[PDB]
Ligand binder design. Sequence first.
Ligand code: CL
Lengths: 139, 141
Amino acid sequence: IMRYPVTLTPAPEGGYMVSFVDIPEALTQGETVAEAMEAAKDALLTAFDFYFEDNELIPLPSPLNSHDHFIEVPLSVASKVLLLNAFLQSEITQQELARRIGKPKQEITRLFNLHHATKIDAVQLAAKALGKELSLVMV
Amino acid sequence: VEIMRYPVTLTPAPEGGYMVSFVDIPEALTQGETVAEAMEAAKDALLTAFDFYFEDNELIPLPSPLNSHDHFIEVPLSVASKVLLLNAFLQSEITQQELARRIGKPKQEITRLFNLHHATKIDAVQLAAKALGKELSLVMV
Ligand SMILES: [Cl-]
């Protein structure tokens, strides 16, 4: 389950500095632990936007300890994060991925943008074009 | 931990065309005039069988392990997510009305959430699974 561990460091001027061991550019702040953790979510989603825009691999979460603070990624985002990494490892072009799925090139663009709504079934078709299988587990 | 693929056998149908039998789903038994029509009928009949189990307050049975050589009918993630949710709903022993109160939605939105023919966002299925104390997660192999 995709959970990014968060580091809270008391800020000298008050509040909590937010960092991610796995996500080096995600740096933010809140007055309280609760507000810091809500700032943390926005910083992680903004850092993802940059990895998608820059065509760079998104580092996976380090395993949690019992007491860790974490940000949980919802399945909409997690599906794309898995897809982006599988796409970049494949070294195919977006044109080639479109050709394999059998869709216009425009329709593949949404796959690599966290703010366009995309059916999980279209993410699954893309994963299959790259020789990968996406599956669901219920615990 | 695997892809949701129901093993089927395909044989000549005694009254013409081809029959598709599911190891795991007696009610998904189907026929078509051509091999192609029988395999597409088997995809439709599988959904209709899932609805029967739900309407009967019974668990949808999960696939048996495949073989190298087995034919199968693969359920896409949209439908697999709702199959997992419907079983977890039945196991939860709460009413639809109680689920609707936990997620803050009118009852009518639960009716559509549980309809295997209705498109539902994977994030709304995950919110519903959480309201039943369950975690839905994605694996890529
Ligand atoms: Cl979806």
